[PDB]
Amino acid sequence: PTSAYERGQRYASRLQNEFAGNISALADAENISRKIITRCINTAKLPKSVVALFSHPGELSARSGDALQKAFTDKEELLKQQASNLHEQKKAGVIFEADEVITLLTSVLKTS
Amino acid sequence: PTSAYERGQRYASRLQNEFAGNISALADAENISRKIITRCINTAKLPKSVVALFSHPGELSARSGDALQKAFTDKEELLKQQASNLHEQKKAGVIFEADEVITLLTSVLK
DNA sequence: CTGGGACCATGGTCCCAG
DNA sequence: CTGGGACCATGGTCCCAG
Ligand SMILES: [Ca+2]
User: Fold this and answer.
1) Protein contacts of strand C with Cβ less than 7 Å away
2) Does any strand D atom come closer than 7 Å to the Cβ of B61?
3) How far, in Å, CA of B39 to CA of B91, rounded?
4) Under CATH, which number does the domain A1-112 receive?
C-alpha cells in the first residue's frame, strides 16, 4: 500500500491547509480513526534522511515511525546526525534491515 | 495478487501441477511460511457460493477462511445450504457485514 | 514433510474524560 | 476538541514432535 510516511505527508498537508488543523474533521473526511492520522502524520515528521535508511519507505511502520518521532522529540539533531552518521556506513556497503534500522537509531539515546 | 481467496487458487495451481503437492516446496518458492500457504489454499477450498456472500473477496481473511474450511470439513453439504439462506436474507433487505457472516456460517455448526 | 501453537507488530477502533 | 490506553483480528514467522 502507500507508505505510512507518505500517507502522513499527505494527511499533514490536508490537515494543515484544508482543515484548519481540526484532526477530528480530517479523520472524518477520510473515514479513518483519528489516531491513525496521528501516527502517520508523526512518522512524516521524521527527517527524509531517516526514511531513506529503509530499503522501501513501506519498511517503516506507522507505529514504529510515530514511536521514533516521539523518542527523539527535542533531540531532532541527534536523530539527524545519528542517521547521516549511519548513512555513511550504508554507502560503505554495510547493510541492515528495517528491524535493526530503528534500533541502531535509538541506540545513541541508550547507555551501552 | 491481493485477495486471500484468490491466492488460495493461485497457490493451489503451483502446488498441484508444479510441486507434486509438496507444500514445503512452493513455500520456499515464494519465500513465505507454510502456514500462510495452508491458510490461503484452505480458504480457496471453500464453496464459491460462500465467498460470493461477502461484499468483496478481500473481506474474507485467510485466517478466518482457513478457519471456516475447517469448521466444515466433511459437512460441506451443510455450508451451501447454510449460505444459500444467507443469500435470500441479504436479498430481502437484511444487510450483514464481514464478521457477522462468519458467525452465521459457524452458528449452525454448534 | 506437516499442522498445531505460542508469539509478534501492525493497522485499526473505540472509549475515557479534561 | 484531544491523546492515552485497552482491545481486536490480521498476516506472518518460528519452534515442536509425529
Ligand atoms: Ca464519514
Assistant:
1) A 4, 32-36, 39, 61-64; B 21-25, 27, 34-35, 38, 70
2) yes
3) 30
4) 1.10.10.2830
